[PDB]
Amino acid sequence: GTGVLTESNKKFLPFQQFGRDIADTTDAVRDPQTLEILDITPCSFGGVS
């Protein structure tokens, strides 16, 4: 994916590898090697008026 990773306070269960949203888009991921939970934000966009 493409996005901004930030530190997150979402508590995963010890088998769940990545979060998801009610659109079924992945908005969190546990990284391996340290098992931190990382949020995913889309890289900021918008029109130019």
């Binding site: 979402k10 508590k11 995963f12 269960l13 088998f15 769940q16 979060g19």
Partner: protein, 254 residues
């Protein structure tokens, strides 16, 4: 024997965190309120997945075997719990007539092995599925009414075909998974707290249609009734080709 399998045997299907949501998924599940078989140890089919449950006090059940013929022609799985390590082998074993833990005699052609930290008024539930060469074991141990979701344990890349299985060894329960769609309720902490079987009764069809656990008063279209055809039914045969005077002619030719 038979027992009702009330709302029991729901497992986390996909290792995905989901928070405060109602996710509707289609996977092999044990249907709600089915007839689970109660046993007090025969071979049993595996047809497409097996739910297993056992209540005990003194770890009397110690593992399982899985396979196709269990006769050293094809490889078979052997899951055995010691007191401290659980051992999972995939080898071409020869099985005894009544295997109980000396079953492991003549362990040949061992194509997989694995050892980990062990399993097991304290009901222990397991779900075994065998999809695309992967053997998935889900379990939960809890102190059979009520709801509890089965965390996964292992996902072994064994690649072997399984048709039958058998418990090694005083009572347990064996149920069979079916390709049914559910609606699972994921908590704020990501755990499953409730589920709805979308073909159990019409009310659960509405709950799966609306993607809600509470429906409001009204009339809701859920599905399509459609009568299926039972038979198949197909010009007064009239003009036979004149093979008689070709074959029963009184005089033939040079």
């Amino acid at each position: 024997a038979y027992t009702n399998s009330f709302t029991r045997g729901v497992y986390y299907p996909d290792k995905v965190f989901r928070s405060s949501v109602l996710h509707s998924t289609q996977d092999l599940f044990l249907p709600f309120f089915s007839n689970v078989t109660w046993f007090h140890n025969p071979v049993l089919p595996f047809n497409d997945g097996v739910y297993f449950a056992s209540t005990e006090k003194s770890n009397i059940i110690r593992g399982w075997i899985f396979g196709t013929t269990l006769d050293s022609k094809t490889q078979s799985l052997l899951i055995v719990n010691n007191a401290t390590n659980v051992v999972i082998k995939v080898c071409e074993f020869q099985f005894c007539n009544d295997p109980f833990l000396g079953v492991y005699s003549s362990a040949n052609n061992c194509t997989f092995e694995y050892v980990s930290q062990p399993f097991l008024k304290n009901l222990r539930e397991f779900v075994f599925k065998n999809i695309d060469g992967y053997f998935k074991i889900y379990s939960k141990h809890t102190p059979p009414q009520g709801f509890s979701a089965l965390e996964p344990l292992v996902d072994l890349p064994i690649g072997i075909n399984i048709t039958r299985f058998q418990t090694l060894l005083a009572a347990y329960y064996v149920g069979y998974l079916q390709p049914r769609t559910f609606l699972l309720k994921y908590n704020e902490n990501g755990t499953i707290t409730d589920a709805v079987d979308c073909a159990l009764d019409p009310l659960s069809e509405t709950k799966c249609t609306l993607k809600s656990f509470t429906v409001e008063k009204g009339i809701y279209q859920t599905s399509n009734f459609r009568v299926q055809p039972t038979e198949s039914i197909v010009p007064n045969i009239t003009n036979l080709c004149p093979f008689g005077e070709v074959f029963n002619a009184t005089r033939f030719a040079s």
